[PDB]
Write a protein that binds this ligand. Structure first.
Ligand SMILES: *C(=O)/C=C/c1ccc(O)cc1
Length: 125
């Protein structure tokens, strides 16, 4: 398992060294988005929580296509504000309930090392 805790202070730096297999080794879900919400990376742990296939979702828009229950001021809105300002580092609880059993999660949004991509981390609560 990669030795990385959810919510760790320099998580985006730690994840900059990981290849695809490495990200799939994390204890929590990890999604990397561009500024419009297109999915760049999507690990095996995330796909297991929500019943999604990483290969089907990479390249799709998270808010439009994949996760319409997040297309709202309370999720998409927080993301878009972080993109616009360059400041993204926030945690919250949410319920994922589209094409899956309703599941309460802890979400951590954080700007990536590069300043044009953005992480969405997910664990069960
Ligand atoms: C609401 O529609 C949530 C859906 C969703 C959340 C997270 C994912 O990785 C995939 C779909």
């Amino acid at each position: 398992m990669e030795h990385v805790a959810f919510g760790s202070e320099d998580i985006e730096n730690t994840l900059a060294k990981m290849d695809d297999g490495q990200l799939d080794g994390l204890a929590f879900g990890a999604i990397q988005l561009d500024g419009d919400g297109n999915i760049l990376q999507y690990n095996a742990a995330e796909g297991d929580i929500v019943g999604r296939d990483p290969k089907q979702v990479i390249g799709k828009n998270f808010f439009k296509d994949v996760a319409p229950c997040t297309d709202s001021p309370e999720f998409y809105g927080k993301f878009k504000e972080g993109v616009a300002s360059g400041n993204l580092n926030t945690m919250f609880e949410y319920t994922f309930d589209y094409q899956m059993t309703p599941t309460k999660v802890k979400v951590h949004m954080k700007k990536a090392l590069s300043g044009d991509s953005y992480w969405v981390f997910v664990k069960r609560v």
